[PDB]
Design a binder for this molecule. Structure first.
Ligand SMILES: NC(=O)c1ccc[n+]([C@@H]2O[C@H](COP(=O)([O-])OP(=O)(O)OC[C@H]3O[C@@H](n4cnc5c(N)ncnc54)[C@H](OP(=O)(O)O)[C@@H]3O)[C@@H](O)[C@H]2O)c1
Ligand SMILES: O=C(c1ccc(OCCN2CCCCC2)cc1)c1c(-c2ccc(O)cc2)sc2cc(O)ccc12
Ligand SMILES: O=C(c1ccc(OCCN2CCCCC2)cc1)c1c(-c2ccc(O)cc2)sc2cc(O)ccc12
Ligand SMILES: [Cl-]
Length: 328
């Protein structure tokens, strides 16, 4: 039994490039009692990997989740053909004792892709759900500003906000994403790379300002949005992707006088905070919503484990519409 594994040859400087990654073919030992052999089906690439990769030693395996099928088993709880969520990192084949695996929701129908397990009915969906509903605390009738709005998390934020009856202003990096999100029904969508003035565009989009800011981007973009938050506005600090691949020091922070005078609340969160019943309910709500068409899905699928680095790099550079998935 062989595996293929993507390792970090060299720490990234700026954006990664191909020579930073190295693929190793490796032999797995046999199963011991109570272990299984997992075959990757779908693997995710995610922005957090750009940051978490800084903690690895050169030669280490890249971290990440996958949908896997059990192909050999000495574990009764896990027969062959069982589909699991697993986090062995970027590897085609792996050995588990079963304690680290997660079976899908029972009510998971065969009419949606298994890979939504890594997207809208998964971690990025949960991030959206908790960031917007608990961190921003959206009630109904609010104007929500969301950036990276065609991406895995932000696309879900916007749709959840719409179904709760909020006005949504979304920023994206391409005209293709603009048109996709308008078709979806977001109230205002613009391309932040081409508008003449971000400030003016944000003002035209919502003259009265913003109640909530679901921030995926940080940096200068956020400095500008902060200038148009309403008094007591709430910012969920979900991510800061404009800084993850940045070469120099960080950009200037936000103008303190504005943050103080507008009495802003800003809270960062990590999705893994919500566990047990709270998490299970969230997942069932997301699946429900997808089954009802209240949340549409789109995926950006890259074919072949050997292109996993390219899939990661393109997502960080904005290639993707919807969740970036690698099909094994
Ligand atoms: N628990 C947490 O707190 C948590 C969990 C998951 C994800 N996140 C964060 O959520 C954000 C979105 O994650 P995702 O998984 O849904 O990925 P994503 O939105 O599917 O993909 C990343 C998107 O980021 C945008 N982007 C990249 N560089 C940018 C820049 N300099 N300025 C503006 N936009 C830029 C690009 O879209 P554009 O074409 O629109 O530029 C790119 O498509 C990231 O900040 C991620 O770290 C946080
Ligand atoms: O805090 C996290 C983080 C926390 C837990 C994670 O879990 C990944 C492993 N996985 C979790 C559950 C299943 C088994 C393994 C991932 C990122 C994030 C960051 C961080 C900061 C400092 C650091 O040294 C490392 C990472 S950056 C980041 C961006 C995100 O979009 C999400 C989380 C994060
Ligand atoms: O990486 C983390 C993690 C990071 C920091 C944590 O605590 C930060 C400070 N810690 C607090 C207690 C005292 C020591 C320092 C806990 C988990 C993972 C999780 C986490 C859980 C809750 C939360 O709010 C944020 C993240 S869940 C998880 C699963 C993994 O396989 C690996 C990492 C993780
Ligand atoms: Cl897992």
């Amino acid at each position: 039994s062989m595996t293929k594994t993507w390792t970090l040859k060299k720490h990234f400087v700026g954006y990664p490039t191909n020579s930073d990654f190295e693929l190793k073919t490796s032999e797995l030992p046999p199963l011991k009692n109570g272990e299984v052999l997992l075959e990757a089906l779908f693997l995710t690439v995610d922005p957090y990997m750009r940051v978490a990769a800084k903690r690895l030693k050169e030669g280490d395996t890249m971290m990440g989740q996958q949908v896997a099928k059990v192909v050999e088993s000495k574990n009764v709880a896990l027969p062959k053909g069982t589909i699991v969520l697993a986090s062995p990192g970027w590897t085609t084949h792996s050995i588990s004792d079963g304690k680290d695996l997660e079976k899908l929701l029972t009510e998971w129908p065969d009419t949606i892709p298994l890979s939504l397990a890594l997207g809208t009915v998964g971690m990025p969906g949960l991030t959206a759900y908790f960031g917007l509903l608990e961190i921003c605390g959206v009630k109904g009738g609010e104007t929500v500003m969301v950036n990276a709005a065609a991406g895995a998390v932000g696309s879900v934020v916007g749709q959840i906000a719409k179904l709760k009856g909020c006005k949504v202003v979304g920023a994206v990096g391409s005209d293709e994403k603009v048109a996709y999100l308008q078709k979806l029904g977001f109230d205002v969508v613009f391309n932040y790379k081409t508008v003449e003035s971000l400030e003016e565009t944000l003002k035209k989009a919502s003259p009265d300002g913003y109640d909530c800011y679901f921030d995926n981007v940080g940096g200068e973009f956020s400095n500008t949005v902060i200038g148009q938050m309403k008094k007591f506005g709430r910012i969920a600090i979900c991510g800061a992707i404009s800084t993850y691949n940045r070469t120099g020091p960080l950009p200037p922070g936000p103008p303190p006088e504005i943050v103080i005078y507008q009495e802003l609340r800003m809270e960062a969160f990590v999705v893994y905070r919500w566990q047990g019943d709270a998490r299970q309910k969230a997942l069932k709500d997301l699946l429900k919503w997808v089954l009802e068409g209240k949340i549409q899905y789109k995926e950006y699928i890259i074919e072949g484990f050997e292109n996993m680095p390219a899939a990661f790099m393109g997502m960080l550079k904005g290639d993707n519409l919807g969740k970036t998935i690698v099909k094994a």
